[PDB]
Design a protein around this motif. Structure first.
Motif, PDB file in Angstrom:
ATOM      1  N   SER A 136      58.511  83.167 -32.050  1.00  0.00           N
ATOM      2  CA  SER A 136      57.714  82.063 -31.450  1.00  0.00           C
ATOM      3  C   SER A 136      58.145  81.368 -30.393  1.00  0.00           C
ATOM      4  O   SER A 136      57.649  80.887 -29.526  1.00  0.00           O
ATOM      5  N   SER A 186      49.166  72.076 -27.615  1.00  0.00           N
ATOM      6  CA  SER A 186      49.774  73.152 -27.353  1.00  0.00           C
ATOM      7  C   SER A 186      51.431  72.904 -26.863  1.00  0.00           C
ATOM      8  O   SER A 186      52.148  73.821 -27.055  1.00  0.00           O
ATOM      9  N   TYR A 199      44.261  72.837 -25.813  1.00  0.00           N
ATOM     10  CA  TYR A 199      43.328  73.622 -25.564  1.00  0.00           C
ATOM     11  C   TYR A 199      41.965  73.028 -24.948  1.00  0.00           C
ATOM     12  O   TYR A 199      41.277  73.569 -24.225  1.00  0.00           O
ATOM     13  N   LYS A 257      45.720  84.230 -23.399  1.00  0.00           N
ATOM     14  CA  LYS A 257      45.598  83.962 -24.707  1.00  0.00           C
ATOM     15  C   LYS A 257      46.668  83.184 -25.358  1.00  0.00           C
ATOM     16  O   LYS A 257      46.286  82.523 -26.294  1.00  0.00           O
ATOM     17  N   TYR A 258      47.824  83.565 -24.999  1.00  0.00           N
ATOM     18  CA  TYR A 258      48.836  82.966 -25.871  1.00  0.00           C
ATOM     19  C   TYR A 258      49.437  81.643 -25.211  1.00  0.00           C
ATOM     20  O   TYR A 258      49.529  81.521 -23.964  1.00  0.00           O
ATOM     21  N   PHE A 301      56.005  79.797 -23.053  1.00  0.00           N
ATOM     22  CA  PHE A 301      56.561  78.701 -22.377  1.00  0.00           C
ATOM     23  C   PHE A 301      57.061  79.180 -20.938  1.00  0.00           C
ATOM     24  O   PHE A 301      57.193  80.341 -20.631  1.00  0.00           O
ATOM     25  N   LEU A 361      56.660  89.353 -29.304  1.00  0.00           N
ATOM     26  CA  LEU A 361      55.561  89.294 -30.251  1.00  0.00           C
ATOM     27  C   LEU A 361      55.860  90.479 -31.217  1.00  0.00           C
ATOM     28  O   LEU A 361      56.735  91.266 -31.255  1.00  0.00           O
ATOM     29  N   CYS A 394      52.191  83.034 -37.400  1.00  0.00           N
ATOM     30  CA  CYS A 394      52.203  81.588 -36.902  1.00  0.00           C
ATOM     31  C   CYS A 394      50.998  81.406 -36.032  1.00  0.00           C
ATOM     32  O   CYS A 394      50.875  82.190 -35.302  1.00  0.00           O
ATOM     33  N   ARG A 449      51.142  80.002 -33.033  1.00  0.00           N
ATOM     34  CA  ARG A 449      51.403  80.448 -31.483  1.00  0.00           C
ATOM     35  C   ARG A 449      51.333  82.250 -31.666  1.00  0.00           C
ATOM     36  O   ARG A 449      50.745  82.838 -30.507  1.00  0.00           O
ATOM     37  N   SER A 450      51.742  82.959 -32.460  1.00  0.00           N
ATOM     38  CA  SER A 450      51.891  84.297 -32.602  1.00  0.00           C
ATOM     39  C   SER A 450      50.508  84.883 -32.986  1.00  0.00           C
ATOM     40  O   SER A 450      50.050  85.872 -32.566  1.00  0.00           O
ATOM     41  N   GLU A 451      49.336  83.989 -33.308  1.00  0.00           N
ATOM     42  CA  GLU A 451      48.158  84.194 -33.259  1.00  0.00           C
ATOM     43  C   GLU A 451      47.409  84.009 -32.115  1.00  0.00           C
ATOM     44  O   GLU A 451      46.490  84.972 -31.524  1.00  0.00           O
ATOM     45  N   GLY A 452      47.206  83.061 -31.514  1.00  0.00           N
ATOM     46  CA  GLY A 452      46.895  82.726 -30.157  1.00  0.00           C
ATOM     47  C   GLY A 452      45.595  82.082 -29.906  1.00  0.00           C
ATOM     48  O   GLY A 452      45.370  81.079 -30.589  1.00  0.00           O
ATOM     49  N   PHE A 453      44.681  82.664 -29.099  1.00  0.00           N
ATOM     50  CA  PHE A 453      43.447  82.136 -28.973  1.00  0.00           C
ATOM     51  C   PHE A 453      43.721  80.618 -28.418  1.00  0.00           C
ATOM     52  O   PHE A 453      43.443  80.491 -26.853  1.00  0.00           O
TER      53      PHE A 453
END
Lengths: 301, 8
Positions: free
Chosen positions: A18, A144, A160, A226-227, A230, A288, B2, B4-8
């Protein structure tokens, strides 16, 4: 143009990575993962140093104190944790967020920790006691990123909800809102503190002048839809903008001309995190679930 | 997982 080349691939996380961060003394890389773990690696030889554990759920972010002796981690278990890096023991558990904690950072003095959460608030914590000093109703959607400026007097947050907000640390009052509403997935101050780098989920990075509230630069060509990925200012050699991308590549732009100067290949999934070494031309990147590894790259400039 | 790894 830089010439970053792969030097090490760091394996051992069992789920998506992450966030990766270099220690301020330049010696360590810390990584957090959805596997509930923090891992500490040598910055120059990629050697695995230790695993730090105790979170009940995955970790979305990690950050170092200024003296490289402490870490703070942000977790889905709704808490942050303060760790002594040397002993790996949890010194404090920072409770009070009512949803996932997404982002964290020490201030330059490192007496304070700032956090952002899915609960749409930003929290300011006392490092010594673990108490929440302030809760800012910062946003109307998950937060975020959070970041202190060079003296810690300002906090910048993104959400967001589409907003970038600059807060006076001492009072918690909002000093400025950048609205010029695509979801903002990442934000951080420039090293001198005059500029703010903001990622939006329309495949765009923007460089803003804080005091003027103007977008000075726009950087495109990467995939970020989507993510929360950084981005970094690279200042050790040439002045670059560095970011991960959803096409599994690390993008490097010339900051002044906005032209892509390099694209690092080798990851097999979204490069969710990139970090720039404090003194050497070294980049750490992390990807990821389909990749799970961290990669160290070195450039001559 | 987590957030962050899920997103949207």
């Amino acid at each position: 143009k830089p010439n970053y080349a792969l030097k090490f691939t760091l394996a051992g996380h069992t789920k998506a990575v992450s966030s990766v961060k270099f220690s301020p003394n330049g010696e360590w890389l810390a990584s957090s993962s959805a596997d509930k773990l923090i891992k500490i690696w040598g910055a120059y030889d990629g050697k695995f140093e230790k695993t730090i554990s105790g979170h009940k759920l995955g970790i979305s972010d990690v950050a170092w104190s200024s003296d490289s002796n402490l870490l703070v981690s942000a977790s889905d278990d709704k808490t942050l944790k303060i760790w002594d890096v040397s002993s790996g023991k949890c010194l404090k558990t920072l409770k009070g967020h009512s949803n996932y904690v997404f982002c964290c950072n020490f201030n330059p003095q490192s007496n304070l920790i700032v956090s952002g959460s899915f609960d749409e608030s930003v929290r300011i914590w006392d490092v010594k006691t673990g108490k929440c000093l302030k809760t800012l109703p910062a946003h109307s959607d998950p937060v975020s990123a959070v970041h202190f400026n060079r003296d810690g007097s300002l906090i910048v947050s993104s959400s967001y909800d589409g907003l970038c907000r600059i807060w006076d640390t001492a009072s918690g009052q909002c000093l400025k809102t950048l609205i010029d509403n695509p979801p903002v997935s990442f934000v951080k101050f420039s090293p001198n503190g005059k500029y703010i780098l903001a990622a939006t989920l329309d495949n765009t990075l923007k460089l803003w002048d804080y005091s003027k509230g103007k977008c000075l630069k726009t950087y495109t060509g990467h995939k970020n839809e989507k993510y929360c990925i950084f981005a970094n200012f690279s200042v050790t050699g040439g002045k670059w903008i560095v970011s991960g991308s959803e096409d599994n590549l690390v993008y490097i732009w010339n900051l002044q001309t906005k032209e892509i100067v390099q694209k690092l290949q080798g990851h097999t999934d979204v490069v969710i995190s990139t970090a720039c070494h404090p003194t050497e031309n070294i980049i750490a990147s992390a990807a990821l679930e389909n990749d799970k590894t961290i990669k160290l790259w070195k450039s001559d400039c | 997982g987590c957030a962050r790894s899920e997103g949207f």
